[PDB]
UniProtKB/Swiss-Prot annotation:
The lineage of its organism: Eukaryota, Metazoa, Chordata, Craniata, Vertebrata. Its main location: membrane. A motif ('Ionic lock' involved in activated form stabilization) lies at residues 134-136. The chain crosses the membrane at residues 37-61, 74-96, 111-133, 153-173, 203-224, 253-274, 287-308. Photoreceptor required for image-forming vision at low light intensity. Required for photoreceptor cell viability after birth. Light-induced isomerization of 11-cis to all-trans retinal triggers a conformational change that activates signaling via G-proteins. Subsequent receptor phosphorylation mediates displacement of the bound G-protein alpha subunit by the arrestin SAG and terminates signaling. Changing residue 15 to D: Normal light absorption. GO terms for cellular component: cell-cell junction; G protein-coupled receptor complex; Golgi membrane; membrane; outer membrane; photoreceptor disc membrane; photoreceptor inner segment membrane; photoreceptor outer segment. This is Rhodopsin. It is a multi-pass membrane protein. The gene is RHO. Keywords: Acetylation, Cell projection, Chromophore, Disulfide bond, G-protein coupled receptor, Glycoprotein, Lipoprotein, Membrane, Metal-binding, Palmitate, Phosphoprotein, Photoreceptor protein, Receptor, Retinal protein, Sensory transduction, Transducer, Transmembrane, Transmembrane helix, Vision, Zinc.
């Protein structure tokens, strides 16, 4: 093979020189400099330092605050949870793996990186499939009476977790295993070899069709059906008594989360596919590695988006720090939500 294969792994590098050992048992410092793996070791550490306290902050604020109860805040809390799963779970393995330069926990450590990432990566995706259908019913209106209430929020969150576990789990009972990637610090599904002992040429097609390409058509469909109804446009301080202005401000954030998804995943999906088509071709370590760790900023953007645009949530998380007794003058145009302050608006 152009790229070396293993019984339970695959190192993308030539072995005519005769240096390649198992990423589980041995290091991989022939793929790069002695301080090149320190990048990843410092990258994961400085990412987990900003991943945990933002996801835990989002978790602390959303549940403690009242007005934040629509499917908007349920699903984006589900993401904050799904993202915190990664920072504490899958990211800590690859931090400790990148600290040594190889999976010190064995082939089990490959799963910790490959399980939490594939799990959290799909909850990031299928959340947008729930949020895509939310725009479809309330805005485009096939059924004008129907609207996503609190019931469909939890069924949406429950729906996201079922799809993620139907992708991440199956690899662990004789199906396509997780194999180290590039510098062998990130660990993803074996699309590197036609390992027909465990259906590595077959099972890879399952995830790229069911757990990927269908969702993006669903999101481009709802974004596409909004060719007439709600195109990219703006409005003043309030509309429909501070309803449609705040509602359309969420519509931005719903179909902005798909924009950020496409930026922080296509790069991995393009390279991961490039290796399936070319099964064991002549490609280097850096070519594949960057994609993976680049893509491992999905445990931070969903919180950032949930904060940055939505002014309904901006004023909420600030109040938890000090705990005051009344709202600011600029406000949100629909009363700001706080722990012991004005989380209230009389409906009209």
């Amino acid at each position: 093979m152009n790229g070396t294969e293993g019984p339970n792994f695959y190192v993308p590098f030539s072995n005519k020189t005769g240096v390649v050992r198992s990423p589980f048992e041995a290091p991989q410092y022939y793929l790069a400099e002695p301080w090149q793996f320190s990048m990843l070791a410092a990258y994961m550490f400085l990412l987990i330092m900003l991943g945990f306290p933002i996801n835990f902050l989002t978790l602390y604020v959303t549940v403690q605050h009242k007005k934040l109860r629509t499917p908007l805040n349920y699903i984006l809390l589900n993401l904050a949870v799904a993202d915190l799963f990664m920072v504490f779970g899958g990211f800590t393995t690859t931090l400790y793996t990148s600290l040594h330069g190889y999976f010190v926990f064995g082939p089990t450590g490959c799963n910790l990186e490959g399980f939490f990432a594939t799990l959290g990566g799909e909850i990031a995706l299928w959340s947008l499939v729930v949020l895509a259908i939310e725009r479809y019913v309330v805005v485009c209106k096939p059924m004008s009476n129907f609207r996503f209430g609190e019931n469909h929020a939890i069924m949406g969150v429950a729906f996201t977790w079922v799809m993620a576990l139907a992708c991440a789990a199956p690899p662990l009972v004789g199906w396509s295993r997780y194999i180290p990637e590039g510098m062998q610090c990130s660990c993803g599904i074996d699309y590197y070899t036609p390992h027909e002992e465990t259906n590595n040429e077959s099972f890879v097609i399952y995830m790229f069709v069911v757990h990927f390409i269908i969702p993006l058509i669903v999101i481009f469909f709802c974004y596409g059906q909004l060719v007439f109804t709600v195109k990219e446009a703006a409005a003043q301080q309030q509309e429909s008594a501070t309803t449609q202005k705040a509602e359309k401000e969420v519509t931005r954030m719903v179909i902005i989360m798909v924009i950020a998804f496409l930026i922080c995943w296509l790069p991995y999906a393009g390279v991961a596919f490039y290796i399936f088509t070319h099964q064991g071709s002549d490609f280097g370590p850096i070519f594949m590695t960057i994609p993976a760790f680049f893509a491992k900023t999905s445990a931070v953007y969903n919180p950032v988006i949930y904060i940055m645009m939505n002014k309904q949530f901006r004023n909420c998380m600030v109040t938890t720090l000090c705990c005051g007794k009344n709202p600011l003058g600029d406000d949100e145009a629909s009363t700001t939500v706080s722990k012991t302050e004005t989380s209230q608006v009389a409906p009209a």
